[PDB]
């Protein structure tokens, strides 16, 4: 079945709008529904904070205390991770699942206790829960995988040619190696002018730009193959081209009624919205995560086209057995696509 | 990286080989079916090899003296289509086994050195003709005499001009084969051998044991060791190739 | 779906859109690695898209001898220990030896008919002038916004320039017999094996265009379906109406026979800039003998005429070709008045004594007899040897008649005044006889042979005693020791 590292159950305690919340998710595309201002963002914020997020890592809560609802004294977060298939590290120590406990008090340090199958504490260090999260290939650190309502709105909105390139590069962690290894203009140039073998550092640095250019070809190619395979659900064709000279993401598309592919910014709202949703899906492909979330993909796409976006999401994500999606959307939309097919766990 | 065993080390006798070519080129409209007196400046095959630009006592690679690591040594060589043309005159198909095996091994050593390999003709018709003279069981048992286990750099070279040998040597080196390849992947993985592992992947992919397609746990092993970001340049290649050998059907 | 067009199954569409995506990212090492990793493995035949042919046609024309830096700034690791131009050429010559077999016993007929469509779409873009449209709809490809590959513009985009498919032919032909490495290398690994592919493909599109054009059509109009033929536009690039004195001097450009062309030699200039310059960081290693140089440059000059007696052979006996305006008889006495004029007799033998005797039939025992008829007009006639090439008795009777006609023995008493030209002339008329004899021995698989034998004995002895009376220190160019060992 699906390899280990998917969330079984989530239990809350006196959160922003939930007093005692309990949800159960599946090992695949997992919709949950509601309406505006129903605490839908609360569960995503909790699931981000419960693993690696900090007090000011969301730009919505100023600290680790405003999360507690006014009048309440403390808060508690507890998650369950499956360990049955590949990825069940030292399963004999705990069992077939891993339980973490994040308790935040009104005053004092926050305990990060880690529990076993039967719920007894086995560790409390942040490093232990962090290595557990990063083993199951969880992208907790990343600020894209568990996109917020406004963070995801920053991508799926009015963009230009040299803006989607920035979003894709930042999301794919390709604006980290082009800065951690771009200060060579002073470490190899200005760090040698003292006599006009200490050049061993420049030797390693030249055998490290290969690492970046051989991980920007095989990572920006996997996000381009899954953009031509997602334009085939509207009977379209096309691709997307990276321009390093301009740092641009010009996307070229060709419709059934069209004879020659034109630029995306020449069509109506629907095709542009579909293309940007396809790019949003393509961004996640190269980076091998295990849990992906999203919130409010209905920022500007109409419901008539939001249905098409839903069908796209369902075909692209449901079949994967190694990416547990936790998409959040208010309206119930299990009435158009093949939600009855095994691989969807719509929850309210 | 820059050193590929260079069978031909000295310079070539460009004046005596030129004379031999002129006599031979008038021996194709007089024979071609019946079997020589065009050449007696090279009475034995060793003399011919010396004429090519090889040194004395030359048929084996041992790597004690960094044998497949000799540098350029920019010596001129004769065209390969003529070196292989002059070489087949010394077959003696119905003769002693030792001379036939000597011819086979000299042919093999002449095949996979950087000088000949980098300046071969795309017509590529003579080498296959020399190949059909032997069966692949005797061309791979009494094969190229490079070592088997650690030496996967000339294995990829062999399976780059004789591709149909891909499943011929993979059942000789790995003599249950599916679990033997992963066993010999850890030994090149828990040894920090990130250069002889790249040519291990390029060699055995495509056979009956390690096919293409989205299906191999190698991409997992080449994902935990990437955290240095400055670790090695032959480890960001090994994962870009393996990401391409999965999207192939 | 005009003609030969084959639609894409979804299992080929994936590899079609993946190779173009890879090539769009300026990553050609993995594009090439896609094809090689699955070549001789299974019965799948991963065909190259038709626009990943015009890429391998442009990756081929950039060798390290003049672009070493660019071939290193692309893939500075060099995993395969080979360049981008020596693997592109090794694929185009590997997917071509598959096309001209059409072996359905291992592959599937669908792949073998799709590959032909790719190749014909590629070679239908080369339209020579004188002085992008992807037919599929499943995918968007490269070459729609990409023009140049690593500086080198393109092959289809350059050969279509006015007066360029004629300059590159003269480029690869004139620099064939060269001594300077910057020039000889521009036509030994860049343009010599590339014209051998273009000619071998233009001559396979013709093999198809004849059948799947109009069966049962008038002869007067069948000759009109050979003026728009692919082999007609190819030979239409020759921008002159003097094929009796222009096609005989375009094939033999850098050869030195007795060149009487009072017109200035054709201006020959490189195709891509920097071609006639070797680079500092590359030193040649292959030593090419001047005999080896003039053995692979006459196996191409003959291969270029061998595709002119295949277009002209199809012209019916009644009419003549319209678009080239050439005759199958004005170019047998044109490639015979210059072939019989060669000075270097080691080039003459290299031309006539061909390594592909069976395929290069049907026109070699036409120039061979056509040349022997051009020499005997000075040595002192009607030659009917090719018409007797099937029955050996008539060919014999003719050759004994010839030797009795004193055309193989030497001339009159003038011996030492003009020996240097007379010996060459009388020996150049022996190769043609030898070539015809070899063809007869190959096309036929009694006492007349013995009569030819003794007649040639007396003729050779006559030349021998004449040379002895010439107060000469060496032997004359005898004939016999070749015929004796040929017959047995």
State whether A37 and A105 are in the same domain: yes
Longest pairwise C-alpha distance within chain C: 82
**Domain range for residue A200?**
177-213
Cα separation, C389 vs A46, in Å, equals 95
State whether A206 and A103 are in the same domain: no
Q: Which letter, b or e, does each residue of C120-153 get, where b requires 16 or more Cβ atoms within 10 Å of its Cβ?
A: bbbbebbebeeeeebebebbbbbbbebeebbebe
CB contact at 8 A, A315 and A29? no
CB contact at 8 A, B21 and C291? yes
State whether A105 and A7 are in the same domain: yes
CB contact at 8 A, A2 and A322? yes
**Domain range for residue C11?**
1-162
Q: 3-state DSSP helix/strand/coil percent for chain B, to nearest 5?
A: 45, 0, 55
Residue A232 lies in a domain: no
Search chain C and give the residue with CA nearest A220. C25
- For residue C20, the distance in angstroms to the closest alpha carbon of chain A comes to 10
State whether A136 and A183 are in the same domain: no
State whether A107 and A201 are in the same domain: no
CB contact at 8 A, B237 and B194? no
Longest pairwise C-alpha distance within chain A: 75
**What is the radius of gyration, based on Cα positions, of chain C?**
26
Task: Say which experimental method was used.
Answer: cryo-EM
Cα separation, A298 vs C351, in Å, equals 76
State whether A4 and A81 are in the same domain: yes
- For residue B64, the distance in angstroms to the closest alpha carbon of chain C comes to 23
Question: How many whole angstroms from its chain centre is CA A217?
Answer: 21
State whether A52 and A183 are in the same domain: no
Of A210, A221, A253, Cβ closest to residue C22: A221
Please return the burial class of C273, using the count of CB atoms within 10 Å of its CB with bins 0-12, 13-18 and 19+.
Answer: exposed
State whether C302 and C267 are in the same domain: yes
Residues 6+ apart with CB under 8 A from C58: C149, C152, C153, C154, C155
Count the domains in chain C: 3
Q: Does the annotation flag A247 for ligand binding?
A: no
Residue A9 lies in a domain: yes
Residue C203 lies in a domain: no
In chain A, breaks (C-N over 2.5 A) are found after 196
Q: Are strands A7-13 and A237-243 parallel, antiparallel or unpaired?
A: unpaired
Nearest in space to C396 (alpha carbons), one of C441, C361, C349, C430: C441
CB contact at 8 A, C91 and C32? yes
Cα separation, C24 vs A252, in Å, equals 13
State whether C300 and C402 are in the same domain: no
Neighbour tally for C468: CB within 10 Å: 11
State whether C8 and C130 are in the same domain: yes
Cα separation, C459 vs C451, in Å, equals 12
State whether C254 and C158 are in the same domain: no
| Token pair of A33 as six digits | 């529904």
> Does the beta-carbon distance from A221 to C138 stay under 8 Å?
no
| Ramachandran bin of A11, using left for φ above 0, alpha for ψ from -120 to 50, beta for the remaining angles | beta
Touching subunits for chain B (3+ Cβ pairs under 8 A): A, C
Annotated resolution, angstroms: 3.3
Nearest in space to B185 (alpha carbons), one of B172, B198, B169, B197: B197
State whether C19 and C116 are in the same domain: yes
Q: Does the annotation flag A36 for ligand binding?
A: yes
| Token pair of A162 as six digits | 């040299």
State whether C330 and C449 are in the same domain: no
- C chain contacts of residue B79, beta-carbon cutoff 8 Å: 286-288, 292
> Does the beta-carbon distance from A239 to C145 stay under 8 Å?
no
> Does the beta-carbon distance from A261 to C21 stay under 8 Å?
no
Domain at A297, CATH number:
3.40.50.300
CB contact at 8 A, C300 and C200? no
CB contact at 8 A, A37 and A45? no
Three-state SS for B222? helix
CB contact at 8 A, A28 and A68? no
State whether C233 and C345 are in the same domain: yes
Axis-axis angle for helices C192-209, C84-92 (nearest 10): 30
Q: Which letter, b or e, does each residue of C384-393 get, where b requires 16 or more Cβ atoms within 10 Å of its Cβ?
A: ebeebbeebe
| Token pair of C405 as six digits | 């006609």
- B chain contacts of residue C288, beta-carbon cutoff 8 Å: 79
Interface contacts (A, C; CB < 8 Å): 41
Cα separation, C338 vs A340, in Å, equals 83
State whether C386 and C297 are in the same domain: no
The CA distances from residue C250 to A252, B161, B210, in Å, are: 46, 37, 54
CB contact at 8 A, A295 and A40? yes
Tokens 């140049």 appear where? C148
Side by side, which strands form the sheet with A22-24?
A22-24, A7-13, A75-82, A97-104, A114-115, A121-123
State whether C325 and C414 are in the same domain: no
Count the domains in chain A: 2
Work out whether the CA dihedral B81, B86, B87, B89 comes out positive or negative. positive
State whether A106 and A23 are in the same domain: yes
Work out whether the CA dihedral C115, C117, C122, C124 comes out positive or negative. positive
Residues 6+ apart with CB under 8 A from C418: none
> Does the beta-carbon distance from A181 to B230 stay under 8 Å?
yes
């Amino acid at each position: 079945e699906s390899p280990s590292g998917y969330i079984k159950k989530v239990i809350l305690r006196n959160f922003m709008c939930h007093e005692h919340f309990e949800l159960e998710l599946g090992s695949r595309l997992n919709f949950i529904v509601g309406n505006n201002g129903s605490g839908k963002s609360a569960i995503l914020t909790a699931i981000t904070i419960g693993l690696g997020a900090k007090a000011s890592e969301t730009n919505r809560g100023s600290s680790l205390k405003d999360l507690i609802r006014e009048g309440c004294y403390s808060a508690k977060i507890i998650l369950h991770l499956d360990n049955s298939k590949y990825g069940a590290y030292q399963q004999g120590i705990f069992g077939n699942e891993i339980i973490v406990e994040r308790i935040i008090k009104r005053d004092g340090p926050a305990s990060f206790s880690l529990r076993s199958e039967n719920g007894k504490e086995i560790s409390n260090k942040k490093k232990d829960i962090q290595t557990v999260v990063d083993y199951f290939s969880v992208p907790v650190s990343n600020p894209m995988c568990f996109l917020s309502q406004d963070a995801a709105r920053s991508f799926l909105t009015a963009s230009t040619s040299q803006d989607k390139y920035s979003h894709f590069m930042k999301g794919t962690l390709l604006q980290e190696i082009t800065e951690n290894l771009l200060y060579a203009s002073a470490i190899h140039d200005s760090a040698q002018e003292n006599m006009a073998a200490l050049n061993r550092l420049h030797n390693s640095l030249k055998a490290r730009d290969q690492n970046y250019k051989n991980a920007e070809k095989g990572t920006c190619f996997d996000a381009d193959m899954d953009f031509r395979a997602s334009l085939k659900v509207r009977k379209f064709s096309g691709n997307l081209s990276f321009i390093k000279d301009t740092k641009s993401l010009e996307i070229y598309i060709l419709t059934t009624n069209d004879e020659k592919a034109r630029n995306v910014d020449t069509l109506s709202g629907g095709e542009k919205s579909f293309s940007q949703m396809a790019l949003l899906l393509a961004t996640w492909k190269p980076m091998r995560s295990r849990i992906i979330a999203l919130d409010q993909f209905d920022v500007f796409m109409d419901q008539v086209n939001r249905k098409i976006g839903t069908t796209l999401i369902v075909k692209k994500l449901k079949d994967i057995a190694r990416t547990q999606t936790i998409i959040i959307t208010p309206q119930d939309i299990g009435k158009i696509a093949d939600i009855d097919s095994s691989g969807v766990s719509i929850h309210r | 990286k820059y050193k590929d065993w260079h069978f031909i080390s000295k310079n070539c006798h460009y004046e005596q080989l030129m004379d031999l070519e002129m006599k031979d080129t008038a021996y194709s409209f007089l024979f071609g079916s019946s079997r020589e007196f065009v050449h007696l400046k090279c009475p034995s095959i060793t003399n011919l090899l010396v004429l090519f630009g090889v040194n004395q006592e030359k048929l084996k690679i041992n790597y004690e003296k960094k044998e497949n690591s000799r540098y350029d040594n920019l010596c001129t060589i004769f065209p390969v289509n003529k070196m292989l043309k002059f070489l087949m005159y010394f077959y003696s198909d119905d003769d002693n086994d030792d001379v036939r095996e000597f011819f086979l091994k000299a042919f093999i050593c002449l095949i996979l050195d950087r000088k000949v390999f980098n300046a071969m003709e795309s017509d590529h018709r003579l080498c296959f003709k020399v190949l059909e003279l032997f069966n692949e069981a005797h061309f791979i048992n009494s094969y190229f005499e490079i070592v088997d286990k650690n030496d996967f750099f000339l294995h990829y070279r062999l399976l780059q001009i004789f591709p149909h040998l891909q499943s011929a040597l993979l059942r000789r080196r790995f003599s249950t084969i599916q679990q033997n390849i992963i066993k010999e992947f850890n030994e090149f993985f828990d040894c920090k051998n990130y250069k002889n592992l790249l040519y291990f992947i390029l060699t055995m992919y495509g056979s009956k044991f390690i096919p293409f397609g989205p299906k191999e746990y190698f991409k997992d092993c080449i994902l935990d060791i990437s955290n240095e970001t400055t670790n090695d340049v032959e480890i960001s290649i090994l994962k870009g190739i393996l990401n391409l050998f999965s999207k192939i059907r | 779906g005009a003609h030969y067009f084959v639609e894409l199954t979804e299992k080929h569409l994936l590899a079609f859109e993946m190779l173009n995506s890879m090539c769009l990212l300026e990553n050609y090492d993995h594009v090439l690695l896609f094809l090689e990793c699955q070549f001789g493995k299974s019965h799948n035949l991963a065909v190259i898209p038709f626009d990943i042919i015009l890429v391998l046609f442009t990756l081929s024309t950039l060798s390290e001898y003049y672009k070493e830096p660019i071939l290193r700034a692309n893939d500075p690791y060099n995993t395969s220990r080979e360049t981008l131009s020596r693997r592109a050429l090794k694929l185009l010559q590997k997917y071509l030896a598959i096309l001209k077999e059409f072996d359905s016993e291992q592959y599937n007929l669908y792949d073998l008919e799709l590959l032909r469509c790719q190749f014909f779409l590629a070679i239908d873009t080369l339209t020579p002038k004188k002085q992008f449209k992807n037919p599929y709809r499943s995918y968007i490809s490269c070459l729609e916004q990409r023009n140049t590959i690593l500086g080198n513009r393109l092959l289809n985009l350059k050969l279509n320039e006015p007066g360029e498919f004629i300059n590159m032919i003269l480029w690869t032909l004139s620099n064939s017999l060269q001594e300077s490495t910057p020039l000889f290398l521009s036509s030994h690994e860049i343009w010599m094996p590339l014209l051998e592919i273009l000619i071998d493909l233009f001559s396979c599109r013709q093999d198809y265009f004849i059948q799947h054009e109009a069966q049962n059509v008038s002869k007067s109009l069948f000759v009109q379906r050979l003026s728009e033929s692919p082999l007609a536009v190819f030979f239409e690039s020759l921008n002159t109406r003097n094929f009796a004195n222009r096609f005989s001097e375009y094939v033999f450009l850098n050869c030195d026979y007795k060149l009487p062309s009072d017109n200035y030699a054709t201006p020959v200039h490189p195709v891509y800039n920097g071609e006639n310059t070797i680079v500092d960081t590359y030193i040649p290693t292959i030593k090419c003998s001047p005999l080896y140089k003039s053995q692979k440059s006459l196996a191409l000059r003959r291969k270029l005429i061998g595709s002119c007696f295949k277009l002209l052979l199809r012209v019916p006996d009644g009419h003549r070709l319209i678009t080239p305006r050439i005759v199958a008889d004005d170019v047998i006495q044109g490639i015979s008045r210059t072939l019989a004029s060669f000075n270097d007799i080691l080039q003459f033998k290299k031309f006539f004594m061909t390594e592909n005797l069976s395929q290069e039939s049907y026109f070699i025992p036409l120039l061979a007899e056509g040349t022997l008829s051009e020499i005997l007009k000075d040595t002192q006639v009607i030659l009917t040897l090719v018409e007797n090439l099937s029955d050996g008795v008539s060919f014999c009777n003719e050759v004994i008649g010839l030797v009795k006609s004193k055309c193989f023995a030497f001339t009159e008493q003038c011996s030492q005044a003009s020996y240097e030209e007379a010996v060459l002339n009388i020996e150049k008329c022996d190769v043609c006889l030898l070539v015809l004899l070899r063809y007869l021995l190959h096309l036929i698989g009694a006492k007349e042979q013995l009569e030819m034998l003794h007649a040639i004995e007396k003729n050779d002895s006559g030349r021998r005693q004449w040379a002895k009376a010439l107060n000469l220190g060496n032997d004359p160019p005898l004939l016999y020791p070749i015929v004796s060992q040929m017959f047995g």
